[model samples]
Target: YMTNGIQAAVVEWIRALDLEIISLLLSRAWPMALLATSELRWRPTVLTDTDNVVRLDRRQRLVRWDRRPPNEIFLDGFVPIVTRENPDWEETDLYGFAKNNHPSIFVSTTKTQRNKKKYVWTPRNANRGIVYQYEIYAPGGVDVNDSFSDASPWPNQMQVAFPGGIQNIYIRSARELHNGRIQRIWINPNFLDPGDLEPIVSSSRTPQVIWRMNHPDGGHRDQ
Candidate 1:
């Protein structure tokens, strides 16, 4: 009973700390992009000859017609379009971290109506043995007020956008084994020249973990 009580207290404390950290990070982070799926049999399409503009279309499949550079696309709402044929799309293997083969973490604004006021940290990769932490940086001086949002003509669908774009991302992670061995990894990118790219104004950090349970029979269970 004593051990259970201690475990409960620790879990509660961790929960409280997580909430506080999330709120703090969201306050400084700006909503930059959004990805949403439709439930009404329509697909979101990026209109041609326009930058960062998208709309729902029934006649066309998911297509990106813009000629902008891949890094400057600023919007990623398509449905596996870029990654369908190529599996190695945007898979960065930094610092020999065992190449988890996961997508990079994207920091964007929440697309849901209720959480419109907050930002969302979307992590795209996973490894059962390792935990990952991410910090996202967005360039500054761009008019954040230049945001865009379009209400779906169809029911249960929405489109939104935020000004300013991501310039750099940093990751730090660690994994612990049952035999008390620990492995730490870091993926740090060189800060881009301010004259070449927008300066970073704020950064947001998020930690991703794989839950595990230790049983009394000297065995471990993955939760």
Candidate 2:
């Protein structure tokens, strides 16, 4: 079905190597529009090395880091801004905010007494690894609302979309890859094959998993 020139396109991911072949086939079927694609590029980071990594905290509210250029700063306490390449670089904006060539993450004090205080500057970490890219394909058009039966178009898939047009997709079934040597089993019944296939009940709360992919035995070399 099409609406506003956009159709209810099936959403899926494809390997980067197959982009040309997939795009060619899609174009042959109908006029297609490549609205967005994932990227495995460098992302801006926080000042502290350890802080740049994600951690699990039940009570803490994890938010996305600000990607805009630094504009303002804090005045109460001294702010520390350090980069991976130039750790000694000490630069601040006219507003006293720490300045960086890239995006950064900032933290605020939890004390109620410091209500007037704004964000504390955390400089970007240049040494961070590049983000993994996943090529997502959506034929017809990308921008459309209320077209799918469920709130999420792909209820059986784990989808993560970023403001930078990056989309990560994961299936909800157990599968073996790398010539059937690598086995991935979804242990949680709430997200396993039959679990995801069932209809979602309104009374049921959202399924929360502690770890997305757990390697109990330890790290294995990438296949």
Candidate 3:
């Protein structure tokens, strides 16, 4: 009952079906491989400013971010540290984001590196978020290299000192948000104090390093 023509036809149909199955499997396989490889290479970060110099220094290596760089959101240099009732974004918010991104804090800097002004005693007007918070926080009445005292909020000693300190600096392009009856200030972290701060030159796409995992992937690369 097996005709030669029918047998051949059946064999050809089976071959075609097999090829279709193979194609489907491979189509998914390539994407799976690509997706699996599409991992974000984020390391932890350590924040330091002893002598108040936040650099694109060793600590920056470990700053982990979910989908984007947290620094990209925070105020750099002598601008206002963003804060609000709704928590639009602040430097500390970046900290929280970093903590959540990494599995074991595989990278992190000090959480409490307080760099407060050792003025001993002075009538500092924290009321006006000067020194730190400035929309047009001009280096107020002095040269770029002048020292900053409560009496002298000028020439922003921090900016001049560390113009190339951190990897990059960002200024606010939006309005400050806050709850009713509250003022916003440019906030530096407890660990990051501002005596003579500086900025680090960087593009937004620099490869933020992670020194702790200097040997991530089994071998250290931070040479």
The local distance difference test score of each candidate is 0.22, 0.20, 0.22
For model 2, how big is the CA root-mean-square deviation? 22.7
Give the candidate number with the greatest TM-score: 1
Off by over 4 Å in 3: 1-48, 51-54, 57-114, 117-169, 172-223
Model 3 lDDT tens row, 1-223: 1111111111222224342332232123223443344322111122223345554222211111111111322323221122121222222221222223222101111111225432111123423321111111111111111221232223122221111112212222111222211222222231233233333323454332321212232121111
lDDT of 1 by residue, 1-223 (tens): 0111111111222224343332232222322232232111111232211123242211111111122211222122111121222223232111111123134221222122223322222233223333222222222111111211232322222222111112232111112222222232222333222133222222244222322222122122233
If ranked by lDDT, best first, what sequence of candidates would result?
Answer: 3, 1, 2
Residue 1 deviation, candidate 3, in Å?
A: 91
Q: How well does candidate 3 score on lDDT at residue 109? A: 16
Name the weakest run of 10 consecutive residues (lDDT summed) in model 2: 69-78
Error of 1 at 102 (Å): 16
The TM-score values for the models, in the order shown, are: 0.20, 0.18, 0.17
What is every candidate's alpha-carbon RMSD to the true fold?
Answer: 21.9, 22.7, 26.1
TM-score of 3: 0.17
